[PDB]
Structure 1
Amino acid sequence: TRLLDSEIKIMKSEVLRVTHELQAMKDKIKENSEKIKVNKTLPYLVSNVIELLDVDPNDQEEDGANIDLDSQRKGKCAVIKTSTRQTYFLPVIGLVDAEKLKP
């Protein structure tokens, strides 16, 4: 049978997407990293880690009213002691990888 080029008519569609995705992501990283940077004002407190905990979701769940933090956490969590003698539980560690901490 006589061949035909019908393949390209489907194949070519993805290019218009991907050429813009590869640019849009490397655009957004600019604003995203600056939005992180502008948060980090240097007057930090200082404080000591007291504990590292292994956390497991609850037995039961809900919608219309569920919390991202009670269930629906699965990694590590921490407990820290501030200088001004507070003790805080932390549900999300933050901008440091939990592997490198120890009490």
Structure 2
Amino acid sequence: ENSEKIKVNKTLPYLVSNVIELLDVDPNDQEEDGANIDLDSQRKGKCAVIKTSTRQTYFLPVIGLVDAEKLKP
């Protein structure tokens, strides 16, 4: 079922983009529950900054379905 979900969420039309950076980010301080965000904090891995072919830059707290170490600027 999970593989089916991944396939249906990977609808074919993609938007080519270039990986500007692979930043390293770490949590800052304690975040009060009730309002805590999984992106601004609780994210210790590698984050990507990409530039879409539409000339739009974007920050990716979760890289996606491609392992970070493979991507290079």
TM over 0.5: yes
Normalising by structure 1, what TM-score? 0.68
- For residues 39 and 10 of structure 2, the distance between their equivalents in structure 1, rounded to whole angstroms, comes to 24
Structure 1: 4+ residue segments shifted above 3 A: none
- For residues 61 and 42 of structure 1, the distance between their equivalents in structure 2, rounded to whole angstroms, comes to 38
Offset of 1:41 from its aligned partner? 1.1
- For residues 60 and 10 of structure 2, the distance between their equivalents in structure 1, rounded to whole angstroms, comes to 18
Offset of 1:48 from its aligned partner? 0.5
Tell whether 2:20 aligns with 1:50: yes
Offset of 1:60 from its aligned partner? 2.6
Q: Encode CA deviations 1:53-89: one digit per residue, 9 max, x unaligned.
A: 0101012321111111111000000000011100011
Q: Which runs of 5+ in 2 are unaligned?
A: none
More strand per residue:
2
Using CA pairs under 8 Å that are at least 6 residues apart, name the structure with larger relative contact order, 1 or 2. Answer: 2
More helix per residue:
1
Residue identity (%): 100
- For residues 47 and 61 of structure 1, the distance between their equivalents in structure 2, rounded to whole angstroms, comes to 33
- For residues 40 and 64 of structure 1, the distance between their equivalents in structure 2, rounded to whole angstroms, comes to 32
Offset of 1:38 from its aligned partner? 1.0
Offset of 1:39 from its aligned partner? 1.1
* Aligned-pair Cα RMSD in Å: 0.8
- For residues 64 and 36 of structure 2, the distance between their equivalents in structure 1, rounded to whole angstroms, comes to 22
- For residues 50 and 57 of structure 2, the distance between their equivalents in structure 1, rounded to whole angstroms, comes to 6
- For residues 56 and 40 of structure 1, the distance between their equivalents in structure 2, rounded to whole angstroms, comes to 29
